[PDB]
């Protein structure tokens, strides 16, 4: 119901809702493991020896580890094999003898693949008594007022992904590319940027694999990667080089008003940390990306076809948004996938 | 076309030294990549190494231990001395050029590609038989 | 420890050699006359070289868990020798020793 001659302060910094949608999502994904089995009886200790592979002496990547596993009956037992990835063992200290990563301090829910990952519109509807206002300036900063707001009783399509570098997805502006803070000339807070133009990014696994069931206990079923038909290749993304560089050009033509004209702008790889801050970090089809992003900010821009591949390494464990005792064990999936998604924004 | 034969002692006694030689005709040994390939009788041939130029050499991971090669390079041949010669060597020795091609099947920037080689002409083999 | 395959001249004949495909292959089949060098007649997995006619082929390597074969169509008394196998393969590490010989022989 769109008003009329009428100034509200927004603030979206200050704001509570986005608070208490940080707080539902990590309730309701508590609350989606609780059905599903505990992988508590397959911590133990792994032997482990290397993929069949024309071996190079200059990368892992891959395990092969046979264990000893209970069985439907408590007092048997079986010797097992699976393929695991070498960011999920930890040579504890012939062939070698790992363990898993979680193994020292929390046995992990392994996720159900009924359920699925990926993303369907969370509308949120006002209550009786409140109402939801919303700009439409399209020149909105993002602090301030919006002298053209608009009252809604529920809220328009948001579908919930999880990234780090560079938001995929995510509704774009449309007059013009626009970037958004808080003080800007603070440091501790973060630059966010909103595009005008979605640059396309394709993401894929080559790696053929073979589910395999394996009955932990009466009534558990434990899904592992059995086989590796086909060919052992690389994970990768691809966005094209011409749009990447169109983009960035609006993205520099942005910032130089907020800085000065005559500043040079260049961009950077990450500084370094964890794993999935400075990594591009998603997921695709069910499995966990992560993706190095050095091969996009390397830049410099003074006053005046192809495609850019990027590596990407996957992690089957996750501890994703870093509690204390609580991670789950993404379960690996049948045949090659892959995903194509829009890119709205970056951080 | 070319024409190319090698020439040995072709009686050997255990635990001896041994050489032979490359001629060429049509090409000469700088331009191409060359092999040597062996075959007991009633046996499948075994490929014991390949030279390049510039110095580029690799041998079998189980002859590593003992052979060495070179080339004659103002002489144009190609030279090759084996070491502790045992019943195990007694084969018609072969000499070859090679042609190298790739065989990409995925991302050529991660390194998944691997060179093949294979051997277009031959040589007209020498038995160098083991004497005890 | 050499098979026989023998079939009637003007027929097809098929070899199988070597170890069953892990990763993607490049074959490699060579030609052994009694009492001479070796010969080649397929470079590639299909690709043959100038003087070797179109009637030999070769199977592709793209297919993964099968076995290399040579399949010669319009056989005949030339035709008549040793065949070799030589897998690269981009998986398992290099083969320094070829495949076994199935000597070919012709009926009649």
């Known amino acids: 119901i769109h008003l009329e001659n009428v100034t509200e302060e927004f603030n979206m910094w200050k704001n509570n809702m986005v608070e208490q949608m940080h707080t539902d999502i990590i309730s309701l994904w508590d609350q989606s493991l609780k059905p599903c089995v505990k992988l508590t009886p397959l911590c133990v200790t792994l032997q482990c020896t290397n993929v069949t592979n024309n071996i190079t002496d200059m990368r892992g990547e891959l395990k092969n580890c046979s264990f000893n596993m209970t069985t439907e009956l408590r007092d048997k037992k079986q010797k097992v094999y699976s393929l695991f990835y070498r960011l999920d063992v930890v040579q504890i200290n012939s062939n070698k003898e790992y363990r898993l990563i979680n193994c020292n301090t929390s046995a992990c829910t392994q996720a159900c693949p009924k359920v699925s990952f990926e993303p369907i519109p969370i509308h949120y509807c006002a209550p009786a008594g409140f109402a939801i206002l919303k700009c439409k300036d399209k020149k909105f900063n993002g602090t301030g007022p919006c002298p053209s707001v608009s009252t809604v009783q529920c809220t328009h399509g948001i579908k919930p992904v999880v990234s780090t570098q560079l938001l995929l997805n995510g509704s774009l502006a449309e007059e013009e590319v626009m970037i958004r803070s808080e003080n800007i000339t603070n440091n501790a807070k973060n630059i966010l940027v909103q595009f005008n133009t979605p640059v396309q990014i394709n993401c894929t696994r080559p790696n053929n694999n073979t589910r395999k069931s394996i009955r932990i206990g009466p009534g558990q079923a434990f899904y592992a990667t059995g086989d590796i038909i086909g060919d052992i290749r690389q994970a990768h993304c691809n966005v094209s080089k011409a749009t990447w560089n169109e983009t960035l050009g609006k993205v520099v033509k942005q910032l130089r008003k907020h800085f000065g004209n005559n500043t040079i702008i260049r961009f950077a790889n990450s500084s370094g940390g964890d794993l999935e801050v400075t990594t591009h970090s998603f997921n695709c089809g069910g499995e966990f990306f992560y993706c190095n992003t050095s091969g996009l900010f390397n830049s410099t821009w003074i006053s005046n076809n192809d495609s850019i591949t990027l590596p990407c390494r996957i992690k089957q464990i996750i501890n994703m948004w870093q509690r204390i005792g609580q991670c789950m064990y993404a379960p690996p999936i049948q045949g090659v996938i892959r995903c194509v998604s829009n890119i709205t924004g970056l951080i | 076309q070319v024409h190319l034969q090698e020439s040995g002692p072709g009686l050997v006694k255990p635990s001896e030294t041994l050489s032979l030689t490359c001629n060429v005709s049509?090409?000469?040994?700088?331009?191409?990549?060359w092999s040597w390939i062996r075959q007991p009788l009633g046996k499948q041939p075994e490929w014991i190494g390949y030279?390049?130029?510039?110095?580029?050499?690799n041998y079998n991971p189980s002859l590593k231990s003992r052979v060495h090669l070179s080339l004659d390079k103002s002489k144009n041949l190609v030279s090759l001395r084996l070491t502790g010669v045992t019943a195990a060597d007694s084969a018609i020795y072969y000499c070859?050029?090679?042609?190298?091609?790739?065989?990409?099947?995925?991302?050529?920037?991660?390194?998944?590609?691997?060179?093949?080689?294979?051997?277009?002409?031959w040589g007209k083999g020498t038995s160098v038989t083991v004497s005890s | 420890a050499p098979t026989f395959v023998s079939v009637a001249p003007g027929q097809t004949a098929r070899i199988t050699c070597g170890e069953e495909?892990?990763?993607?292959?490049?074959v490699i089949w060579y030609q052994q006359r009694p009492g001479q060098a070796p010969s080649l007649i397929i470079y590639?997995?299909?690709?043959?070289?100038s003087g070797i006619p179109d009637r030999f082929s070769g199977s592709p390597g793209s297919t993964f868990g099968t076995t290399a074969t040579l399949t010669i169509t319009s056989v005949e008394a030339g035709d008549e020798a040793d065949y070799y196998c030589?897998?690269?393969?981009?998986?398992?590490?290099?083969?320094?020793?070829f495949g076994e010989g199935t000597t070919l022989i012709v009926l009649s």
């Open positions: 070859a050029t090679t042609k190298h091609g790739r065989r990409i099947y995925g991302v050529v920037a991660f390194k998944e590609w691997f060179t093949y080689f294979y051997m277009d002409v």
């Open positions: 049509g090409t000469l040994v700088r331009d191409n990549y």
């Open positions: 030279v390049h130029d510039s110095g580029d050499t």
């Open positions: 495909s892990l990763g993607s292959r490049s």
């Open positions: 590639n997995n299909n690709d043959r070289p």
């Open positions: 030589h897998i690269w393969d981009s998986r398992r590490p290099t083969n320094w020793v």
